[PDB]
Design brief:
Layout (H helix, E strand, L loop, with lengths): L1 E8 L5 E7 L5 E8 L2 H10 L8 E7 L2 E6 L5 E2 L12 H20 L2 E2 L8 E3 L5 E3 L6 E2 L1 E2 L2 E2 L14 H5 L5 H18 L12 H7 L13 H10 L10 H4 L3 H4 L4
Helix pairs in contact: 2-4
Bound molecules: ligand U0Q.
C-alpha cells in the first residue's frame, strides 16, 4: 500500500517519512509513531486554514499509529534561508504576513503551537506558508477561559524569556516571540542567541540596545523597529498580533 521512499525529518514524537502510494505514485507526508497522541490527533481535526498543513487521516497497527498530511512541494522555509544572508525583504514580508494569519487562526480557536521555527513552516506549490507539526500544540483557551502554561518546551533559540524564568505564563506572547526570531532568521540568515537568558551575552547586548552588532546590523531600520516591539523581555509589554498588523514595515508595500 505505501513505500517510505525518503525520510523528511524527526518530529517531537518519532519521525515523518515521505511515503509514495505504490498504486497511484501519490507523494504524501506520513508520521509513524510506535508505542498525547490522542491530543495531537484531536487538535489536527480542529484545523482548517490556508496557512496550516491539510490533515488527511490516521490508522493503527498494534500500538503503531499513522498520520497523513498534505505533502509540501516547496519544502520548509528553513531551506529558503541563505546562511549569513537570509532572503529578499519582500519574500520575508509575505511569509511573515502568512505566518501571522496562521498564528491568528490557531490562537482564535484557543490553540498554541509552542514550536514555531523555519523547520516547521512548510511551503506549497505556489509558495504559501503552512504551519505544521502539532506535537507540542495544546489548548490555552476553552469555553472562553484562558489557561496559563507551565510546561517548558520548544527550541531554545526560539523560546521566549518568560518560559525560562516563570512558573506560569500566557501562551500567545510565547508564539509571538518565536515569530520575531523567525523574522530575524529570514532577514539576517542567523539566530541572534542560543537562549534568551541573563547569562547569554548576545541577548544582554540586545537588551542594552546594541543594534550596531549582528544580526541587527544586516536588518533595515523599519523591520528592526518591529523586532524591537516583538523581542521585549516582559511578555505583558511585548506587542500583540493586532498591534503587529498596525506596524509600519508590516504595511510597507515591497518589491
Ligand atoms: C514539519 C515537520 C517537522 C519534521 C519534518 N516535517 C515535515 C513535514 C510534515 N508534516 C513535511 C511535509 N508534509 N512535506 C514536506 N515536503 C518536502 C520536504 N522536502 N521537500 C523538498 C519537500 N516536508 C515535510 N517536512 C520536512
Amino acid at each position: 500500500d505505501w513505500d517510505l521512499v525518503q525520510t523528511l525529518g524527526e518530529g517531537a514524537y518519532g519521525e515523518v517519512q515521505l511515503a509514495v502510494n505504490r498504486v497511484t505514485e501519490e507523494a504524501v507526508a506520513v508520521k509513524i509513531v510506535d508505542m498525547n497522541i490522542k491530543k495531537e490527533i484531536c487538535i489536527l481535526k480542529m484545523l482548517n486554514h490556508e496557512n496550516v498543513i491539510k490533515f488527511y487521516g490516521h490508522r493503527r497497527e498494534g500500538n503503531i499509529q499513522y498520520l497523513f498530511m498534505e505533502l509540501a512541494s516547496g519544502g520548509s522555509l528553513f531551506d529558503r534561508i541563505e546562511p549569513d544572508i537570509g532572503m529578499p525583504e519582500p519574500d520575508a514580508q509575505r511569509f511573515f504576513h502568512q505566518l501571522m494569519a496562521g498564528v491568528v487562526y490557531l490562537h482564535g480557536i484557543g490553540i498554541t503551537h509552542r514550536d514555531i521555527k523555519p523547520h516547521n513552516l512548510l511551503l506549497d506549490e505556489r509558495d504559501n506558508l503552512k504551519i505544521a507539526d502539532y506535537s507540542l500544540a495544546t489548548v490555552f483557551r476553552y469555553n472562553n477561559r484562558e489557561r496559563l502554561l507551565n510546561k517548558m518546551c520548544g527550541t531554545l533559540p526560539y523560546v521566549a524569556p518568560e518560559l525560562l524564568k516563570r512558573r506560569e505564563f500566557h501562551a500567545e506572547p510565547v508564539d509571538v516571540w518565536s515569530c520575531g526570531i523567525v523574522l530575524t532568521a529570514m532577514l539576517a540568515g542567523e539566530l541572534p542567541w542560543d537562549q534568551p537568558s541573563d547569562s547569554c551575552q548576545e541577548y544582554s547586548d540586545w537588551k542594552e540596545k546594541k543594534t550596531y552588532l549582528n544580526p541587527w546590523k544586516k536588518i533595515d531600520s523599519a523591520p528592526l523597529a518591529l523586532l524591537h516591539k516583538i523581542l521585549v523581555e516582559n511578555p505583558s509589554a511585548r506587542i500583540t498580533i493586532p498591534d503587529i498588523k498596525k506596524d509600519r514595515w508590516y504595511n510597507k508595500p515591497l518589491k
